């Protein structure tokens, strides 16, 4: 896999890792950890 | 694939087919090249086929998976061991120049080593001692050392006379009014002078050069 295409996966995994933090407390209230 | 498709061995097969028929259908084929019939009955030889090379020494029998089965082997004779023993005992025998340029290849036809060291066509050198030693060692059933001594002493008696001739031949020529040129001892010394002088020029030039480096280390530009 080229480096240009690897950066497409890099942006997807970061925005997801960044999303699971923001909604971590909300998922803890509903018992969805 | 840096190589190219060489079809040099099929120039006949290819030319024979291109000349069998005519491109213009309905006409007889024109005459073929002048060389098509000359090599009609002289096909090429088989190339690029690795055979089992000639074995100049008994191959290792204990090897169960031997390699290099298609590698030419070294040519070693019984004389190779004798040449090394002699020339090592007589290192300066190599300084005596020897010509390895053959004239017609028919040199081994007049060599009868049952007569002595002096043979026809070849000079008296360490080889004549080796060939004489190998003969006595094989025919007369002598040992390596026994044959070596006999063939080695005959070599000295012949070389001694050679050095005695140079001395007497010159001394004999002057007794009747015969003069010669510059001997090798004098010419050799004159050459050293021309070289020694050139070294002296190089020494004085570098010596003076180093003085500048010694003085340039310290600084005295102020001129106190």
């Amino acid at each position: 896999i080229s480096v240009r295409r690897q950066k497409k996966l890099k942006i997807k995994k970061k925005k997801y890792k960044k999303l699971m933090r923001r909604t971590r407390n909300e998922r803890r209230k509903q018992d969805r950890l | 694939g840096k190589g190219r498709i060489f079809q040099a061995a099929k120039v006949y097969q290819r030319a024979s087919e291109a000349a069998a028929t005519n491109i213009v259908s309905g006409l007889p084929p024109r005459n073929p090249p002048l060389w098509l019939k000359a090599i009609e009955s002289i096909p090429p030889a088989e190339i690029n086929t690795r055979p089992y090379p000639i074995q100049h020494s008994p191959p290792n029998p204990r090897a169960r998976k031997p390699r290099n089965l298609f590698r030419p082997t070294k040519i070693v004779y019984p004389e190779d061991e004798l040449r090394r023993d002699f020339y090592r005992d007589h290192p300066w025998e190599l300084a005596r120049p020897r010509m390895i340029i053959e004239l017609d290849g028919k040199d081994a036809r007049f060599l009868d080593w049952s007569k002595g060291l002096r043979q026809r066509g070849i000079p008296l050198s360490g080889e004549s001692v080796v060939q004489r030693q190998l003969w006595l060692m094989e025919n007369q059933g002598m040992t390596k050392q026994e044959a070596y001594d006999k063939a080695r002493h005959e070599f000295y008696k012949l070389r001694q006379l050679e050095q005695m001739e140079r001395r007497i031949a010159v001394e004999e020529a002057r007794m009747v009014g015969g003069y010669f040129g510059k001997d090798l001892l004098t010419v050799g010394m004159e050459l050293e002078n021309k070289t020694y002088e050139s070294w002296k020029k190089w020494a004085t030039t570098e010596i003076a050069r180093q003085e500048s480096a010694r003085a340039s280390m310290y600084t005295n530009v102020v001129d106190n």
């Binding site: - | 530009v221 102020v222 106190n224």
Partner: protein, 88 residues
Amino acid sequence: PNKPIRLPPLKQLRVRQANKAEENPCIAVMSSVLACWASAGYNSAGCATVENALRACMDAPKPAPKPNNTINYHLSRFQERLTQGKSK
């Protein structure tokens, strides 16, 4: 210790600067002048003999260029023989 390796196949076996680069000699004399001023002084008498040498240097004519070195030509003859071969 190991011996020199057999160079890989190169495009060209050559030396960048065949003929040595000559350094301006008068630049060395100037450095000596600047040394006196640093230690002795500017309007002094110790730099007299050194300042004169700097004027005589710039006045003298520069040497002539030396004949180019033919090293790169001989390196190109024995490249394929000395190295692994030529690459391109």
